[PDB]
From Swiss-Prot:
Organism, scientific name: Synechocystis sp. (strain ATCC 27184 / PCC 6803 / Kazusa)
A Pfam family reported for this protein in Swiss-Prot or TrEMBL: GUN4_N
UniProt family annotation: Belongs to the ycf53 family.
Gene Ontology molecular function: tetrapyrrole binding
SUPFAM superfamilies: ARM repeat, GUN4-like
Protein name per Swiss-Prot or TrEMBL: Ycf53-like protein
InterPro entries xref list: ARM-type_fold, GUN4-like, GUN4-like_sf, GUN4_N
Length: 230
């Protein structure tokens, strides 16, 4: 029933929107048309809205020529403003996420964080915790929004932060929860990681622990999360 499923999508219950979206996408032209109209009425986003990310990504994931063409033409930069306090280009990150190429997205994200930190970090290819503390909130919001919107809320530093808070800020409890350690065994980069949505909540983006937790803690304590309601 397309009418009733459309109504379910346009009602205000997030949980019921998500089941309606999944059903509509499998209902051919009529269902896909309802989803395309939902994007037209809700994109560009101002604030991240999970259901809108799910509509976009569900349609991309069909990998059908005409839908993909239409999405690229109407939403060439995706659904979320690609804003940066340093003029950085986040389109390649968006493109990797829209293709569900999470490994490429992780690599791009790591490079962009060094670019954001400046020439010293770009040169050495790793961060100091004080550089993280000084990141502009806007860039972290753009980066996180893309991860979250393109992963059904499963990925993003905001997701890790809330799991870290749920763990009493105990990093040794966080690592197993996000799949980065299994008992005594550290998940080996890159081959040990799960580069798809079967991964546990918070699995990506990665934060190497070779130089300790200081970068991750500074990232999770950054004012961006409270500022933007993450
Ligand atoms: C021995 C055990 C450890 C270890 C070793 C190590 N990691 C390396 C690289 C590297 N690991 C990650 C990610 C992770 N690696 C993990 O184990 C985990 C689970 C917490 C994550 C999430 C990324 C993204 C890069 C590329 C970016 C970068 O190099 O920073 C290198 C090569 C260093 C080099 O060649 O210079 C070495 C030797 N890393 C650790 O976390 C533990 C304690
Ligand atoms: Cl550090």
């Amino acid at each position: 029933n397309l009418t009733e499923l459309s109504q379910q999508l346009h009602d205000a219950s997030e949980k019921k929107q998500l089941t309606a979206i999944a059903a509509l996408a499998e209902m051919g032209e009529g269902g896909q048309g309802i989803l395309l109209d939902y994007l037209a009425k809700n994109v560009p986003l101002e604030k991240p809205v999970l259901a809108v990310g799910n509509v976009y990504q569900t349609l991309r994931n069909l990998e059908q020529e005409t839908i993909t063409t239409q999405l690229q033409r109407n939403y060439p930069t995706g659904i979320f403003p690609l804003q940066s306090a340093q003029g950085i280009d986040y389109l390649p990150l968006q493109e990797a996420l829209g293709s569900q190429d999470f490994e490429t997205a992780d690599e791009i994200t790591r490079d962009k964080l060094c670019e954001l930190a400046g020439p010293g970090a770009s040169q050495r290819q790793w961060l100091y915790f004080t550089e993280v503390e000084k990141f502009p909130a806007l860039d972290l919001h753009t980066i996180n929004a893309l991860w979250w919107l393109h992963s059904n809320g499963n990925f993003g530093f905001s997701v890790q932060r809330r799991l870290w808070l749920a763990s009493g800020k105990e990093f040794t409890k966080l690592w197993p929860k996000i799949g980065w350690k299994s008992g005594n065994v550290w998940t080996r980069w890159p081959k040990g990681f799960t580069w798809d949505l079967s991964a546990p909540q918070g699995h990506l983006p990665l934060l190497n622990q070779l130089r300790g937790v200081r970068v991750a803690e500074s990232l999770y304590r950054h004012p961006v999360w409270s500022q933007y309601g993450w």
